[PDB]
Design a protein around this ligand. Structure first.
Ligand SMILES: CCCCCCCCCCCCCCCCCC(=O)OC[C@H](COP(=O)([O-])OCC(O)COP(=O)([O-])OC[C@@H](COC(=O)CCCCCCCCCCCCCCCCC)OC(=O)CCCCCCCCCCCCCCCCC)OC(=O)CCCCCCCCCCCCCCCCC
Ligand SMILES: CCCCCCCCCCCCCCCCCC(=O)OC[C@H](COP(=O)([O-])OCC(O)COP(=O)([O-])OC[C@@H](COC(=O)CCCCCCCCCCCCCCCCC)OC(=O)CCCCCCCCCCCCCCCCC)OC(=O)CCCCCCCCCCCCCCCCC
Ligand SMILES: CCCCCCCCCCCCCCCCCC(=O)OC[C@H](COP(=O)([O-])OCC[N+](C)(C)C)OC(=O)CCCCCCCCCCCCCCCCC
Ligand SMILES: CCCCCCCCCCCCCCCCCC(=O)OC[C@H](COP(=O)([O-])OCC[N+](C)(C)C)OC(=O)CCCCCCCCCCCCCCCCC
Ligand SMILES: CCCCCCCCCCCCCCCCCC(=O)OC[C@H](COP(=O)(O)OCCN)OC(=O)CCCCCCCCCCCCCCCCC
Ligand SMILES: CCCCCCCCCCCCCCCCCC(=O)OC[C@H](COP(=O)(O)OCCN)OC(=O)CCCCCCCCCCCCCCCCC
Ligand SMILES: CCCCCCCCCCCCCCCCCC(=O)OC[C@H](COP(=O)(O)OCCN)OC(=O)CCCCCCCCCCCCCCCCC
Ligand SMILES: CCCCCCCCCCCCO[C@@H]1O[C@H](CO)[C@@H](O[C@H]2O[C@H](CO)[C@@H](O)[C@H](O)[C@H]2O)[C@H](O)[C@H]1O
Ligand SMILES: CCCCCCCCCCCCO[C@@H]1O[C@H](CO)[C@@H](O[C@H]2O[C@H](CO)[C@@H](O)[C@H](O)[C@H]2O)[C@H](O)[C@H]1O
Ligand code: SF4
Ligand code: SF4
Ligand code: SF4
Lengths: 44, 318, 155, 51, 176, 145, 52, 115, 94
């Protein structure tokens, strides 16, 4: 019988392509608050 | 016994510089999914020696159009001044204890710029000239902000003596009360050392090699040794300024180990930054410092004059 | 013994030169793409001590990676002349080797060795990145065989 | 084609040919380092520009 | 269908504005980029240890040329000149005459390896599998003249490489 | 602890190469101290190894012999020293080493592989393989005129 | 890019100048197992674009 | 003395490296080798021709700003004064006038390069 | 694949991705370098009858150009105006 390179019977599994840049990090308020907290401890 | 101490400073500096070239190529390599030098000596440990020997037996060229005396003078100034930057550094004891060590370092940094300007001008070639004039712009960009950043920090130390910074930071690193200045200082040292993303006076992808494009063999090596020596020296300066190591007078070598680790990591950060970012445009560098750092640096300078006075925490003069 | 000393000194300078080969950032056509793949992580030419540098004043090797046309010939000879010595030329690909697919063109130099001396000829169109690396390692073993000081001693 | 087994003429239209011809137009008012960026944004290969 | 790559309006609520102020002042998106290169530092590099390790190839690889024989040892080439006719580079030069036993065989068979474009048309054109491109790619030379192959060189290549060439042809001849 | 298991593997490499002397030989000859399964050896002394836990391209490798065809190759190794039977396996053109699937024997195949001979007295020199085309008249050896 | 050069070399025998697409179709059919390997490459590629 | 000895040693070490660099290697000098570099083609015009400075106004402002820091660097010492009311007022006064001058040059488009 | 757990965690955290699910280095998911032989199909012209070449000869159906005008009512355009593209419903905005 004919034998040549073919996809599997059900096809290949799904393939991602869409952009994915995960959302990380604390908010602006929390980050500024930690910065000021460090400053005040330094000054003291 | 002082001459021995001088040699035990500059021989190690040049050896550390040579192996910083290997470390950079390996660190960049692994960050780039490759290895970097690993064939010349085990783990590439003889690679800096091969390059050094190669360059100093390579034919040095004096360009037909160059100004001979200035062409030779500039690389000599570059390396000479780079080694001079190390003499007041307290590790923990300076080779030369200066009252105004910080001011000395500022002045010598300014003088080292002329090794770029004169080498580029003396080459009498267009890419060399363009590189040198980029150094003029770079110096104009960072120098004013760099001095005022130091001033704000020294208002907590109380003196221009480098060894006092050790005393100042005995309880706590100055990075805590002055991390905004540390941020701006760290960037300024990249610009000061012509390091990426501020590698503009060489700007390989734009100027081929910029100010040193006409230099070959040993004269070129002098410029390379100078820049890499300044990169290490400026991160030692950053460690002393902001990450003060505690000093036990009876175990001075514990200071040296702790301080050496900090300076190394700060130097590794320079390589890390080079691996990560694109290059600035040299007018965009000037706008970064003048339109962002300088307004903030002026404001913080006002704050750090007032803060000791209002908190009754002015440091001792001595 | 003088001979023993110059023999060992030849080994040192030969080792230093082959261990630290800096090609000029010089590419001409398709073959430069395989040259790019030698710098890429799989082969990592940097790990042999092979580093591209843009300036001819700071280059040890010229890899002629692609067709040399008549209009380009004076420029290639110029940047070759501007390399300090010792300097080496690696001819990469059929075009550089002898004209290749364009051998009979009115605008092509039939081999870069009409313009510059060539140390190593890397065949292919293009040579694989590994074939070019084999050519560079061949250049290294040529440098290792040099006898400059030994011949000077017997002058 | 002229009916034989060899082409009579083959003009190649390279997209980078017209793009590079517009480099001067696109670089107006820009600095040297922007011209470096503009060359890359056109995506030029001189195998096709020159033929 | 089409999509817009860069047509979005930033929100102006105080939280979003501060989030952007923290980004501008604390360099958060620059720090994020440092994280990516750090992750690569701790990934195993992709470098192979040439020449002790070799990049992978397939049976179809087009490398150095070689002239082949039948199992008896007779040359397969019968001087038909199809390879010479098809060669896009005119890299092949052939002369032929009746051999002393009357066979149709070449007296010249040259390949200018500095003209050749390693395209494989010659081995497609050959009706008897005489001229092939073998798997060797490590044959760079110190002189130009060493790359002007004559019949003796090409036959020596076939005798040198026949063990690999025959196995490579065995793997791929059913795709031809 | 994993950091301890890592150090154990590093020490197993010194014994896996037959001791510090064997470990240093391979480190300085091949800049790699990994240990693999000996797939086979060829008549010139090249040893072939594999480790299928390594990623594709690093899962096969050769430690070149120190002497081939009268040449000292302790420090001078090159890819042209691999004979054709192992060349196919080393380049992953096949999965089967010549130990398992030996090549078809012919009486005209080289019994002795030769590496790249460029730059040596054994280098190939091109020449025209055809005989002279025009035959010139030879004058008589006698005087008669 | 180096892994995609392998696809070129596996269908044609050349990493770059395949000369594979011809008037009439292609020179040779896909070797067995090639589409599996293209799928493995394509499965991971978008993540590489994300890093870029 | 220690200082002069240290400077002399550094700049002598650099000078020796240059002396070795020039006298140790084998030289082969000819016209084409020493010609000015410009990517393979001969330069068009001298490199001594005027090179326009587009940041000329920032460069002059640098001179004025670079003298301000000379006036400010004594501030750590001035903070030891007993007359801290005057000193703090004059320190803040000087820095503000520096900020005002910066804001003026900024708003008047002095920090933009000439195109 | 040989990274220790802590190192996998570190680089996973630094990049913000799970890097172990899509390693860029190939291991054993790739095809075997030796394959069974193929048996390729034939084309539509592989027949023993009803297969005369003159009925499947594309070249001999090519014709010289139609001369529309030579030098020996509503306005028209070369083709209908192009239909406006629609926005992607997969992801209209990047
Ligand atoms: C450590 C010092 C490192 C610098 C070493 C400089 C000498 C290097 C050897 C060298 O010059 O090359 C060969 C060079 C000759 O090569 P050449 O190509 O045949 O001719 C070169 C030009 O004719 C002449 O060369 P030129 O075009 O460069 O001009 C000559 C010279 C101009 O020379 C003069 O006209 C008078 C002498 C100038 C030096 C005096 C100082 C100038 C006033 C400032 C006061 C400073 C006091 C110290 O130019 C200078 O400005 C000299 C600057 C020296 C700065 C020293 C640092 C202070 O010099 C000779 O050996 C003769
Ligand atoms: C100054 C600094 C230098 C002085 C410190 C010296 C410390 C000793 C270093 C020894 C490393 C040798 C490791 C080893 O046994 O080889 C395994 C290796 C066999 O292992 P394998 O089968 O290939 O698999 C490797 C892992 O599975 C795959 O590799 P992996 O990525 O999974 O790493 C495994 C292991 C490897 O790491 C170590 O064992 C050494 C850790 C030193 C940390 C210092 C920083 O690391 C760990 O298990 C995690 C803890 C390590 C600390 C990680 C923290 C990184 C910094 C945090 C990120 C932020 C940075 C900014 O055997 C060898 O090949 C021996 C080669 C010898 C290499 C040179 C070693 C000497 C280094 C210089 C000594 C001083 C001069
Ligand atoms: C951080 C600094 C790093 C410095 C690294 C220093 C390098 C250390 C390794 C030195 C190796 C020995 C030098 C050999 C290289 C010489 C260059 C070369 O290849 O020439 C080939 C030439 C070949 O010459 P040739 O006669 O055979 O042919 C050339 C002439 N034509 C072109 C016609 C063919 O060798 C020589 O001419 C002399 C070789 C002598 C080797 C001994 C060197 C003595 C050093 C004194 C030199 C005098 C100046 C003083 C310099 C300062 C002294 C230290
Ligand atoms: C100043 C002195 C600096 C000492 C450098 C010593 C160089 C060490 C060295 O040669 O590496 C081993 C090298 C390694 O040999 P190799 O360079 O042929 O290795 C080829 C690459 N591998 C091994 C991966 C296949 O040994 C030599 O080549 C002999 C050179 C001896 C130099 C004589 C010094 C006197
Ligand atoms: C254009 C080409 C240029 C080429 C470059 C050539 C190299 C030049 C390098 C720079 C030259 C300027 C050097 C200035 C040194 C200033 C350093 C300093 O102030 O400290 C040195 C020391 C003062 O110590 P101090 O702590 O301030 O007070 C004494 C407390 N016991 O005071 C001393 O140690 C005594 C120093 C007196 C001699 C100074 C000589 C300088 C003259 C310039 C050379
Ligand atoms: C987010 C990425 C940012 C990238 C930018 C680059 C930043 C890198 C910065 C590197 C330097 C960070 C600090 C390095 C820590 C070194 C630890 C050490 O060796 O010393 C131990 C130290 C405590 O000792 P000590 O400093 O003497 O105490 C202070 C009192 N004066 O430590 C105490 O535990
Ligand atoms: C109690 C009252 C207290 C009062 C005092 C309060 C003070 C604290 C609050 C003030 C704000 C704190 C932050 C100040 C830091 C400086 C911020 C800054 O200057 O960033 C702005 C600058 C410009 O960004 P840009 O978007 O291009 O332009 C803005 C629009 N014109 O952005 C940039 O600089 C971009 C820099 C590009 C080059 C970066 C290359 C390196 C990046 C990695 C470095 C990581 C940092 C490590 C630091 C190590 C320190 C040793
Ligand atoms: C363009 C022109 C801009 C000009 C801007 C000028 C701004 C000046 C702002 C005032 C600065 C000084 O502000 C003033 O400092 C002094 C001391 O330092 C303070 O004085 C306080 O401390 C001092 C001693 O330290 C005591 O003598 C005094 O009893 C006490 O009140 C004042 O309470 C405060 O009002
Ligand atoms: C006491 C020291 C600390 C206080 C700060 C002192 C420095 C003040 C700096 C100038 C402030 C006002 O002056 C400045 O005017 C120009 C108008 O061209 C504005 O600048 C405007 O164009 C430039 C260039 O595109 C950008 O900065 C910005 O996009 C825009 O705001 C600045 O946003 C504003 O800051
Ligand atoms: S030799 Fe082949 S690949 Fe190289 S430049 Fe010429 S045509 Fe392109
Ligand atoms: S591979 Fe192509 S160019 Fe080379 S000889 Fe064969 S047909 Fe000619
Ligand atoms: S096509 Fe084959 S048989 Fe014909 S001349 Fe060429 S090599 Fe010989």
């Amino acid at each position: 019988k004919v034998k040549q390179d073919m996809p599997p019977v059900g096809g290949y599994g799904p393939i991602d392509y869409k952009r994915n840049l995960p959302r990380r990090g604390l908010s602006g308020y929390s980050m500024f608050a930690v910065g000021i907290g460090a400053l005040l401890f330094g000054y003291w | 016994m002082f001459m021995i101490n001088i040699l035990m400073l500059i021989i190690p500096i040049l050896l550390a510089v040579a192996f910083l070239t290997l470390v950079e190529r390996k660190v960049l390599g692994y960050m780039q999914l490759r290895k970097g030098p690993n064939v010349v000596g085990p783990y590439g440990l003889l690679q800096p020696i091969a390059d050094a020997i190669k360059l100093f037996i390579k034919e040095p060229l004096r360009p037909a159009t160059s100004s001979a005396s200035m062409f030779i003078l500039a690389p000599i100034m570059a390396l000479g001044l780079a080694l001079t930057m190390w003499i007041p550094l307290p590790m923990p004891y300076p080779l030369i204890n200066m009252n105004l060590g910080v001011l000395f370092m500022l002045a010598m940094s300014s003088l080292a710029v002329y090794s770029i300007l004169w080498s580029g001008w003396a080459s009498n070639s267009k890419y060399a000239l363009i590189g040198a004039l980029r150094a003029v712009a770079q110096t104009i960009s960072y120098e004013v902000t760099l001095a005022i950043i130091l001033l704000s920090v020294l208002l907590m130390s109380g003196s221009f003596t480098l060894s006092t910074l050790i005393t100042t930071q005995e309880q706590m690193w100055l990075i805590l009360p002055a991390w905004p200045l540390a941020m701006m200082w760290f960037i300024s040292t990249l610009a000061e050392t012509n390091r990426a993303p501020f590698d503009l006076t060489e700007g390989e992808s734009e100027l081929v090699s910029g100010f040193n494009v006409e230099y070959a063999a040993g004269p070129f090596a002098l410029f390379f040794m100078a820049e890499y020596a300044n990169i290490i020296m400026m991160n030692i300066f950053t460690a002393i300024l902001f990450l003060g190591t505690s000093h036990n007078p009876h175990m001075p070598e514990l200071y040296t180990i702790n301080f050496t680790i900090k300076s190394l990591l700060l130097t590794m950060s320079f390589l890390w930054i080079r691996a990560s970012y694109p290059r600035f445009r040299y007018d965009q560098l000037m706008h970064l410092l003048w339109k962002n750092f300088l307004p903030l640096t002026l404001a913080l300078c006002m704050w750090h004059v007032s803060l000791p006075i209002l908190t009754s925490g002015i440091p001792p003069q001595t | 013994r003088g001979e023993y000393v110059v023999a060992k000194l030849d080994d040192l300078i030969n080792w230093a030169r082959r261990s630290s080969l800096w090609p000029m950032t010089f590419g001409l056509a398709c073959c430069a793409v395989e040259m790019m793949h030698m710098a890429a992580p799989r082969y990592d030419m940097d790990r042999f001590g092979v580093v591209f540098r843009a300036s001819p004043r700071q280059s040890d090797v010229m890899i002629v990676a692609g067709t040399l046309t008549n209009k380009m010939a004076p420029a290639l000879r110029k940047v070759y002349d501007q390399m300090p010595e010792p300097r080496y030329v690696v001819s990469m690909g059929s075009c550089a080797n002898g004209g290749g697919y364009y051998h009979y063109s009115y605008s092509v130099v039939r081999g870069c060795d009409r313009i510059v001396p060539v140390d190593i000829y890397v065949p292919g169109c293009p040579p694989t990145a590994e074939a070019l690396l084999y050519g560079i390692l061949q250049l290294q073993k040529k440098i290792k065989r040099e006898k400059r000081l030994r011949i000077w001693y017997r002058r | 084609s002229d009916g034989s087994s060899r082409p009579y003429r083959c003009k190649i239209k390279a997209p980078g040919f017209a793009h590079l011809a517009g480099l001067d137009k696109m670089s107006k008012g820009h600095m040297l380092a922007d011209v470096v960026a503009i060359i890359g944004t056109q995506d030029i290969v001189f195998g096709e520009v020159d033929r | 269908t089409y999509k817009y790559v860069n047509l979005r309006e930033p929100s102006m609520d105080m939280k979003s504005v501060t989030d952007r102020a923290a980004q501008t002042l604390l360099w958060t998106e620059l720090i994020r980029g440092l994280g990516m290169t750090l992750s690569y530092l701790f990934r195993e590099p992709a470098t192979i240890n040439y020449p002790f390790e070799k990049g992978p190839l397939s049976p179809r690889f087009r490398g150095e040329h070689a002239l082949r024989r039948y199992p008896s040892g007779e040359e397969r080439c019968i001087a038909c000149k199809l390879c010479e006719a098809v060669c896009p580079a005119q890299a092949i030069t052939i002369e032929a005459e009746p051999r002393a036993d009357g066979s149709r065989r070449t007296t010249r068979y040259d390949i200018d390896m500095t003209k050749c474009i390693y395209c494989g048309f010659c081995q497609e054109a050959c009706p008897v599998d005489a001229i092939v491109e073998g798997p060797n790619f490590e044959f760079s030379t110190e002189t130009h003249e060493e790359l002007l192959y004559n019949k003796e060189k090409l036959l020596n290549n076939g005798d040198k490489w026949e063990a690999e060439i025959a196995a490579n042809i065995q793997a791929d001849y059913l795709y031809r | 602890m994993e950091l301890l298991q890592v150090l154990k593997r590093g020490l197993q490499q010194v014994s896996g190469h037959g001791g510090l002397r064997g470990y240093l030989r391979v480190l300085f000859r091949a800049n790699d101290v990994r240990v693999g399964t000996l797939v086979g050896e060829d008549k010139y002394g090249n040893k072939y190894y594999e480790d299928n836990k390594q990623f594709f391209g690093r899962h096969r490798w050769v430690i070149y012999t120190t002497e081939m065809n009268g040449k000292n190759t302790f420090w001078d190794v090159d890819g042209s020293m691999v004979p054709p039977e192992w060349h196919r396996w080393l380049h992953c053109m096949t999965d089967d080493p010549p130990t398992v699937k030996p090549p078809t024997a012919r009486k005209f195949i080289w019994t002795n592989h030769k590496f790249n001979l460029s730059g040596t007295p054994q280098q190939y020199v091109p020449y025209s393989t055809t005989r002279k085309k025009i035959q010139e008249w030879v004058p008589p050896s006698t005087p008669y005129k | 890019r180096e892994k995609m050069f392998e696809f070129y070399e596996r269908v044609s025998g050349a990493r770059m100048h395949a000369a594979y697409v011809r008037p009439g179709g292609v020179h040779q059919d896909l070797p067995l197992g090639l589409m599996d390997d293209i799928y493995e490459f394509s499965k991971n590629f978008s993540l590489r674009i994300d890093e870029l | 003395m220690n200082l002069m000895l240290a400077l002399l040693t550094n700049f002598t070490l650099a000078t020796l490296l240059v002396i070795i660099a020039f006298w140790l290697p084998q030289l082969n000098v000819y016209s084409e080798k020493t010609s000015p570099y410009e990517c393979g083609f001969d330069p068009m015009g001298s490199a001594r021709l005027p090179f326009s400075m587009k940041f000329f106004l920032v460069a002059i402002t640098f001179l004025l700003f670079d003298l301000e820091i000379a006036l400010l660097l004594p501030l750590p010492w001035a903070s030891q004064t007993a007359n801290l009311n005057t000193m703090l007022t004059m320190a803040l006064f000087l820095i503000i006038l520096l900020a005002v001058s910066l804001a003026y040059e900024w708003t008047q488009k002095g920090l933009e390069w000439t195109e | 694949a040989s990274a220790t757990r802590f190192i996998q965690w570190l680089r996973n955290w630094a990049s913000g991705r799970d890097l172990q699910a899509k390693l860029q280095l190939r291991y054993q998911e790739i095809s075997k370098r030796t394959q069974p032989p193929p048996k390729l199909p034939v084309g539509p012209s592989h027949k023993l009858s009803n297969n005369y070449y003159c009925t499947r000869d594309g070249r001999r159906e090519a014709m010289p150009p139609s001369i529309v005008m030579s030098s020996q009512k509503k306005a028209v355009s070369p083709a209908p105006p192009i239909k406006r593209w629609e926005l992607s419903q997969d992801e209209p905005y990047l």
